[PDB]
Structure formats: C-alpha cells, structure tokens
Short mmCIF file of C-alpha atoms in Angstrom, two decimals:
data_model
loop_
_atom_site.label_atom_id
_atom_site.label_comp_id
_atom_site.label_asym_id
_atom_site.label_seq_id
_atom_site.Cartn_x
_atom_site.Cartn_y
_atom_site.Cartn_z
CA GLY A 1 94.03 90.49 69.56
CA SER A 2 91.83 92.23 71.84
CA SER A 3 91.00 93.29 74.80
CA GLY A 4 87.09 91.17 76.31
CA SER A 5 88.11 87.68 76.90
CA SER A 6 87.83 85.93 80.36
CA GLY A 7 88.34 86.23 84.10
CA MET A 8 86.87 90.49 84.43
CA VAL A 9 84.41 88.08 86.24
CA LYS A 10 84.31 84.67 86.54
CA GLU A 11 81.93 82.56 89.07
CA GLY A 12 80.82 78.81 88.87
CA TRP A 13 81.59 75.60 91.56
CA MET A 14 84.55 74.55 91.17
CA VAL A 15 86.66 71.62 93.15
CA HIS A 16 90.27 70.88 95.15
CA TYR A 17 92.41 69.45 97.67
CA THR A 18 94.79 70.00 99.52
CA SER A 19 98.30 68.41 99.60
CA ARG A 20 97.40 68.16 104.19
CA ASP A 21 94.11 67.51 103.61
CA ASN A 22 93.47 65.86 100.57
CA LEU A 23 89.42 66.18 101.58
CA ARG A 24 88.55 67.12 98.37
CA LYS A 25 85.96 70.40 98.42
CA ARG A 26 83.68 71.84 96.43
CA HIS A 27 82.39 75.38 96.69
CA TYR A 28 81.66 78.74 94.54
CA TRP A 29 85.03 79.81 93.14
CA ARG A 30 85.08 83.88 91.92
CA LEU A 31 88.13 85.28 90.03
CA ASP A 32 88.39 89.32 88.89
CA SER A 33 90.72 90.72 87.31
CA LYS A 34 91.21 92.36 91.18
CA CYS A 35 91.49 89.32 93.46
CA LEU A 36 90.94 85.16 93.67
CA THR A 37 87.34 84.55 96.73
CA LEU A 38 86.25 81.57 97.33
CA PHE A 39 82.20 81.52 98.42
CA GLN A 40 80.89 77.90 100.72
CA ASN A 41 77.96 78.38 99.09
CA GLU A 42 76.28 81.37 97.00
CA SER A 43 72.85 82.43 99.90
CA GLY A 44 75.93 85.11 100.86
CA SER A 45 77.57 83.99 103.98
CA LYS A 46 81.21 85.63 105.08
CA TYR A 47 84.01 84.69 102.40
CA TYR A 48 86.50 81.20 102.39
CA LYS A 49 89.28 82.68 101.49
CA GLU A 50 90.78 85.09 99.74
CA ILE A 51 93.88 84.75 96.81
CA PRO A 52 95.37 87.46 95.69
CA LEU A 53 96.89 87.51 92.06
CA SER A 54 100.12 87.95 93.97
CA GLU A 55 99.99 84.57 96.16
CA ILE A 56 99.25 82.53 92.70
CA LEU A 57 102.96 81.81 92.11
CA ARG A 58 102.92 79.91 89.09
CA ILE A 59 101.39 76.66 87.60
CA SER A 60 102.58 73.00 88.43
CA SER A 61 103.14 70.17 85.81
CA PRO A 62 100.43 67.51 85.50
CA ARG A 63 103.25 64.96 85.63
CA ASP A 64 101.80 64.30 89.37
CA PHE A 65 98.70 61.98 88.49
CA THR A 66 98.30 60.77 91.37
CA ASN A 67 94.75 62.65 93.71
CA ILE A 68 93.06 60.45 95.50
CA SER A 69 93.52 56.55 96.24
CA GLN A 70 92.42 54.32 93.13
CA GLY A 71 89.58 56.40 90.13
CA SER A 72 90.49 57.70 86.76
CA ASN A 73 89.77 61.19 87.67
CA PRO A 74 92.52 63.32 87.87
CA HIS A 75 93.70 67.09 88.04
CA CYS A 76 94.57 69.59 85.33
CA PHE A 77 96.50 71.93 87.65
CA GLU A 78 97.65 73.23 90.13
CA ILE A 79 97.84 76.58 92.31
CA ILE A 80 101.25 76.84 94.02
CA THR A 81 101.22 79.73 97.13
CA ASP A 82 103.74 81.22 99.50
CA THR A 83 101.68 79.33 102.02
CA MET A 84 100.23 75.66 99.85
CA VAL A 85 100.19 74.11 97.69
CA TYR A 86 96.18 73.48 95.87
CA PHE A 87 95.32 71.19 93.58
CA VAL A 88 92.30 71.80 91.21
CA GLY A 89 90.62 70.15 87.74
CA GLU A 90 88.68 67.77 88.14
CA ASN A 91 88.83 65.17 84.20
CA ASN A 92 86.37 62.62 83.67
CA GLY A 93 87.13 61.50 80.64
CA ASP A 94 85.77 63.34 77.57
CA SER A 95 86.78 66.57 75.36
CA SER A 96 84.01 68.16 73.79
CA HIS A 97 81.87 70.62 74.81
CA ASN A 98 79.74 70.54 76.45
CA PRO A 99 77.34 73.42 78.09
CA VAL A 100 75.23 71.35 80.13
CA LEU A 101 78.13 70.06 82.74
CA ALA A 102 80.37 72.55 81.99
CA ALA A 103 77.77 74.65 83.73
CA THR A 104 78.68 73.39 87.26
CA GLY A 105 81.74 73.16 86.34
CA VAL A 106 82.66 70.07 86.38
CA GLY A 107 85.12 68.86 83.78
CA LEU A 108 88.17 69.29 81.77
CA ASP A 109 86.95 71.66 79.43
CA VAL A 110 85.71 74.35 81.69
CA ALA A 111 88.89 73.71 83.72
CA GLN A 112 90.79 74.77 81.22
CA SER A 113 89.04 77.78 80.92
CA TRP A 114 89.80 78.84 84.23
CA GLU A 115 94.06 77.71 84.42
CA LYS A 116 94.18 79.93 81.32
CA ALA A 117 91.66 82.71 83.13
CA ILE A 118 93.85 82.55 86.41
CA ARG A 119 96.67 82.52 85.06
CA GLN A 120 96.14 85.00 81.86
CA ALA A 121 95.15 87.18 84.80
CA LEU A 122 99.38 86.96 86.25
CA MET A 123 100.23 88.66 83.54
CA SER A 124 97.95 90.88 82.91
CA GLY A 125 98.01 92.92 85.88
CA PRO A 126 101.20 95.77 85.85
CA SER A 127 104.49 94.06 87.12
CA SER A 128 107.17 95.79 89.10
CA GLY A 129 109.35 97.55 87.17
#
C-alpha cells in the first residue's frame, strides 16, 4: 500500500535471446514509467531497441526449459511482442540475496525483480476505458 517501488527508473546489464537468433546478447537494459530501452554500452551510443509497455502483450510460462544446446542455466521469463518472442533471464543456481553478483543483473533473484517491474508497469499505467 505505497507509491514507491522499482519501476520508475531501473537500469542494468541483462542477457536475452530471440527465437530466430538464439545468439545470446548482453546489453544495459533500461526500463522506466515511460518505455523500455536497450543500451549496447554504458558509454552512450545510439539506442538499440525501444520496447514500449504497449508492445509487451504479456509474459509466457517457464514451461519451456530449453535455451542452449546443453546446460543448467534456464530462463526466468519471456517478453512476447507482436514482433517476436524474447527470452530474458538467467538462472545460475542460487536463491539468496546477493548484492555482489546481482549487481550486474545476473541470476534468478535479480531477474525476478525485473519481470515484476516490466509487468507491474503494464498495469501501473491507465488502460483504455
């Protein structure tokens, strides 16, 4: 019951992969109460891709537990858009508060926060009525 949580301004390094190009990609993901943007680097170069809360239809189920040929680093959530499906999140294998490794944005813990933010922002804003 408060108006203060992660969502207004969130930035960090996140890794994702597309269905067509499984080639994982790591970039400084940035989200806000306006729209989501990607930054290839912190330096400050032309944006990469803009993902408006609108595009993000919804989140898929974790059912699909297959990202790479072989390994133990499944995904946490997936961003489904009218364009294509995006797989974001990486589980290293540890469920505990780690402000040391979670800093970069790697792990399930950190991911859980993002997924909640990107999703929480969907409802946060007013819907057509």
